Paper text:
[name] ([name]) is an electroneutral Na+-independent Cl-/HCO3- exchanger belongs to the SLC4 transporter family. The widely expressed [name] participates in a variety of physiological processes, including transepithelial acid-base secretion and osteoclastogenesis. Both the transmembrane domains (TMDs) and the N-terminal cytoplasmic domain (NTD) are involved in regulation of [name] activity. Here, we report a 3.2 Å cryo-EM structure of the [name] TMDs in complex with PIP2 and a 3.3 Å full-length mutant [name] structure in the resting state without PIP2.
To investigate whether PIP2 regulates [name] substrate exchange activity by allosterically disrupting the interface of the [name] TMD and NTD, we introduced mutations (i.e., [name], [name], and [name]) into [name] and then determined their structures. The mutant [name] proteins were expressed and purified under the same conditions as wild-type [name] and a map was reconstructed at an overall resolution of 3.3 Å. Analyses showed a strong density of the [name] NTD which was not identified in the AE2IF/PIP2 state. The mutant [name] TMD also adopted an inward-facing conformation with a RMSD of 1.704 Å compared with the TMD of AE2IF/PIP2 state. Because the substrate exchange activity of [name] harboring the [name]/[name]/[name] mutations was significantly reduced, we designate this structure as the AE2IF/REST state. Aligning the TMD of the AE2IF/REST state with that of the AE2IF/PIP2 state by gate domain showed that inward rotational displacement of the AE2IF/REST core domain is greater (with a RMSD of 2.280 Å) than the displacement of core domain in the AE2IF/PIP2 state. PIP2 densities were absent from the dimer interface of the AE2IF/REST gate domain. Without the binding of PIP2, the intracellular half of TM7 shifted 6.2 Å (distance between Cα of I935) toward the core domain and the loop connecting TM6 to TM7 moved upward away from PIP2. Loops and β-sheets between TM10 and TM11 of AE2IF/REST state (missing in the AE2IF/PIP2 state due to their flexibility) stabilized the interface between the NTD and the TMD through several electrostatic interactions (between E508 and K1073, K348, and D1079) and hydrophobic interactions (between I347, F349, P363, L506, I510, P511, A1074, V1075, A1076 and P1077). Electrostatic interactions formed between E356 in the NTD, and K1157 and R1211 on the other protomer further stabilized the interaction between the AE2IF/REST TMD and NTD.
Numbering used by the authors:
A (entry chain B), B (entry chain A): 320 to 431, 503 to 638, 673 to 854, 894 to 1221
Write the structure that this text describes.
Amino acid sequence: PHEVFVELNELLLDKNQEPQWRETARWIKFEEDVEEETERWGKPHVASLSFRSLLELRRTLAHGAVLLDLDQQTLPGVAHQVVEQMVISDQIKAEDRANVLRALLLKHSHPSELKLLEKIPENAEATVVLVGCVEFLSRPTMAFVRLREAVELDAVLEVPVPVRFLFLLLGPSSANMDYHEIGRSISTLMSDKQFHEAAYLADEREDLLTAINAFLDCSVVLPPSEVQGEELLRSVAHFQRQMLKKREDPLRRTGRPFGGLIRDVRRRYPHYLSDFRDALDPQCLAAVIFIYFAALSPAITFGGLLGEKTQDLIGVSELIMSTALQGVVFCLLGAQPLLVIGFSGPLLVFEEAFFSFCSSNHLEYLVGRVWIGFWLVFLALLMVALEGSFLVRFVSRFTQEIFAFLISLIFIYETFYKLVKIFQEHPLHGPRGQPNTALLSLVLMAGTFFIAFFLRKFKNSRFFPGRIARVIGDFGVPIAILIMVLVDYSIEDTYTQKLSVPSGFSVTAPEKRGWVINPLGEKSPFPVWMMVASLLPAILVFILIFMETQITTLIISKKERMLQKGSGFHLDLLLIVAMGGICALFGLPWLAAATVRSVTHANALTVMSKAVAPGDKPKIQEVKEQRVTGLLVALLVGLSIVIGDLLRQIPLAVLFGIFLYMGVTSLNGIQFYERLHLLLMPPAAHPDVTYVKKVRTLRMHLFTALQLLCLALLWAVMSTAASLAFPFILILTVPLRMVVLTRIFTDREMKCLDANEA
Amino acid sequence: PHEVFVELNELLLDKNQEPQWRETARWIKFEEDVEEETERWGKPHVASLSFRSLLELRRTLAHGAVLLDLDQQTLPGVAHQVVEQMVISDQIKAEDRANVLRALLLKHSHPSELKLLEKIPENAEATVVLVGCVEFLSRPTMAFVRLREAVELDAVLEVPVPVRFLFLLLGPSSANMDYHEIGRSISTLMSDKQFHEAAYLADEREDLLTAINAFLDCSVVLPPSEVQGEELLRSVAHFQRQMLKKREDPLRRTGRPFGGLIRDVRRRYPHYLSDFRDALDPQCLAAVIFIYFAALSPAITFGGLLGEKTQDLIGVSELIMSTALQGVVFCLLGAQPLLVIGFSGPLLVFEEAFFSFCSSNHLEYLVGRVWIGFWLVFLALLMVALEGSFLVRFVSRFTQEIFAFLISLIFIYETFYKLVKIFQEHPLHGPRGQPNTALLSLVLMAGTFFIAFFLRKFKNSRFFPGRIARVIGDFGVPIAILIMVLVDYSIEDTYTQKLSVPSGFSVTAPEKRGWVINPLGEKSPFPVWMMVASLLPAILVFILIFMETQITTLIISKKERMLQKGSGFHLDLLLIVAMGGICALFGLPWLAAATVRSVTHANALTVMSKAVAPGDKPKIQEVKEQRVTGLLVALLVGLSIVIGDLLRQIPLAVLFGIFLYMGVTSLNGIQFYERLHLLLMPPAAHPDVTYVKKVRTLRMHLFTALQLLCLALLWAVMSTAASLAFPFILILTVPLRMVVLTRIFTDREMKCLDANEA
């Protein structure tokens, strides 16, 4: 089976009023049409035919000329043999054979070479369709030629490809046939996957006719009624699938303890040296630059906020080093260095939720986190030993979207509650009570949000090339902070709460904390009941780390990602938590492998294949798969503590704008949020999605109501004094979905509403 | 020719495990398919067929049964006659005739009546397609029945329509034919405009077969290659037009002086009493409510700004009365009461531009406008007398889009220059010098912009029904002002510049001005050279009124608007200017018939026809065409001066936010702005628009550069001391387009780049 690039060049008059063949269309995949007015190739489109043209093609092909395995290699000699064969079958009178021969030898023309060769598959044989209105003849005349050898004909094609099938059609007008449409019909057949397969094996004129019928019976005949909108033709794609259908792992559990750890070590580690060679490509150097701002910006927005929530015990300087200390050690030893380890959003809403519990019960907060670390290590060892990392299968779209919607509700609430706090501390009247502090904070808070919100749309708009914005992922955030910091920097005599960052490798609050947190009680003795009961917070933390890291590994290890090298589930979970349990001893926060950063890292290294035919979705040729982009990003984040002066000038109102921005944008893409929109829209206006078409409106609104009810239970718990339990309530939905929603919704509805990939 | 509603109900098993015909699709126009999973009718779509099904239909129809002019009216009797005719032609054995008869008489079923009757044309005759898999037969069997009389059959259709054509098909499986697809093929043929026309006149089985060929030869045969995106199938609509194509005034000038005035008086005035009767419909009462906020909100945003630009000589109170004084008199006497007369944007940028000239040359500003009024009256009489209102043909998309883009540049600039003025008068430090005044003004200015900007998107989003938002046009502006006024109202001890509106029918600045401006000089004598040279500003004003009113009358008088009553060009131009020349004597501003308000008024009264088949674009059945909605809106605006306390609490920073909002949104829809976007995007990403497809990229960028160069000439003039001349420079583009761009661009390119309607 050979791929075919079929070119239709028609006999037309040039600007010099001379007859010459001009390329009118070409078929690599689908069809591209020359616009005579502008001499520009049109956008690729489905080669729609006219049934009258196909009927005329079938009529002329019967009693037509046939040149099979023509042992000729020169266009003039081939043309002379074609004319002889045509006059054998009485198609052309011997008087006009000279004129037909002269018409065959005319100079071909094209609108304009290396670029187009890339799109066509390398091992392809082109088909030339010579169709034109000839005046000296009185009857239409056709000749299908199959060359014995793939001979690159003499300057006949726009792109030099060995010509295999030569198609000739020369007939006068007034025959009620459009030769331009007959040329498109025969060219479309030759580009068809199965029609040319019958052309290679064709042995008689009847066989080629039978090949047409095998094409028509697989076709779609539209009616002559016109089309008013694109939604009318949306079902044509779905119907065309029905017609053709009628014609036609790391999570595996082994009994060996630490078995998943051993397999993942034996998979990626053999490619350790290869992990450093693949980094020499210049695309990796662009990944370091554009991901460094994707891993540093959330390191200060969460680092700054932890400075307020935890009274500067854990601030930016600790989160900067914790991101760098773990980011380097993970890349040097992890099985998936494409993961960007960082302080996830859900972990932030736990530290704020755990600080209140330690503040209420008169427990040292930092020492209370040391003992969570000692129990995070034990649970991580226990789970990896028993290979219990396959439970991420049960965490499905019902639980993920409830969580990702609850967090985005917290981010929106926490800024607006911070904003209300500012106005109550700095009321509008003619440090506390500072004029212009409340409003400038609102301007900065709403300045970075709308700058970053609109630049995200500009990223996704038609202005930015897809090949570029894939590499540079979410650059609105770094520039929004830079712009509004300078806006606040220019202002003088007005106080805005600045980021609390001390210069040098020092604690954010040196007077209150030391580098090594004493596990036995820093200032006051630590109660012996809490060091044993810290397992309960540790399980709740471990759920937030296990869910965030293992889901992320699932997202980037899919076959669509084209990750050739081994991806490790067990080895990453152990490192992310065993470092998190040891980084807690030094007061540094524990981290998870965030999904948004990791995909931004994975996308930046995806190399889209150049050999894509026009009109086809780009396919990921490969991914760089190196340990250096993750390593350098980790080191550069750690070196951000060198600029402690620049970070100290970032207003805290600027970060809350980004904090609100990340809350709002994370809603996009969540089916829970999308199905909340449908709760307001009328049933007629619901979009044609899988969960909408195959599920009736009433059942869909019941499913969304249950998710919304399961989200109000989480919010009620979070506002009470037992806010630590929201990880446990969250994974009560997994028993709920697998047991309660199983008997309410049929398997058909759950397969549509809870889809692993969609 | 009868419209046909063709229903395909197939023989299928019910939830009771009993055989009964179930409606699977219906064809009023295009096709709607029953989704078996949810029992919901799918969205209308083109009835795409499979060529195998059409071939099987043609095969079975040959040697098939034919019942033409069957003189029967009962479904059991018709079925028995059909069975007799089928067994005559050996299609069904006499042994199985009882089973076929039993299968014909089965109870039909449908998913669910008055609503669907509206969509179908009233005088229509339905076609029933009975297709099902019958097991007791060994061969497929078909019977096409054309009833002699249009008999509403016994509960056979979902919607009771007199059945004319009855189509029967009963055949076993294993015949390599999908009866559901054969049923869709025959149903699609019957719904075709020309196929059933041959069915009514059909006289033999051969004739019906020939009718199929007349259908296929007008069809579009898609290839079996799948479709990846909707842009692939976008060309299918364009190609389908080619296939079918191959098969197939008030501006008039008369020699009589004031001739246009007489015709327009003799056209609309006879319907004067009808203009008041048509207003009793409840839709008119909704127009008054929703347009009152569309005519009042720009009356204060321009009224407030004129308070600053003209030092409160002409403010809100004068613009409110001028809008009401002219709005009432125009509706009582104008030939097109659908016009909403109001202070256009271009007139605002002249009063600001004319005030500077009067301030620089030591001329009384208000007296200087009285003499422009006396010369506006004379020019209006002169133009209407000579019927020179046909010059609006020459003001084309080249001049309109240059103007509408220049103004939107002024609106954006004027707010940002006001905002800079506030900060320099109220600097940020720990009336003048007021703290919190500069930032709160920015918050209010950016508050109303983003509230109104996002609510405009919510208006156009899928959430808001199209039938509603057409009635309620641009309601984001009234609610944005209301929300941010309350936000500023709650604030205390902070000063924001409030609207300057005195309560009662009083001048905005009583100490400086009187109600009647003395034409001979109010305080100081008016120079006798300026009262004669005021013709020069009068011509420049008259261009801004003529261009804005006559273009608006063109926009709403198009045939697509379905304005049955006479629309007047000459009578409106005379009234709008002759009142404007007389309203200037009292210090009130002159007004034009704004396009945006008028279309918002015209749309609110358009009654969309209920008798629209599914999938068709709604057609405007009629427009109310009354003089009362315009009258009541005018009176309600005048009564807004009663609430002088409420208007006095609107901050001037709130209005500048709306002022900026109207500048930004007016850019949308302008091809000049759209072609500026293409100047940045690569040629591959250019949208498939008429001026893009038929004009090469280099020539299009030359045309846009010329427009951008012609916009920089206007801005340079406007920033100089002769800012009054921008009306004259603007209509220098009409000679430029008709003379200079004629020789640069071919008529093919100008027909695409400058399209009157697109």
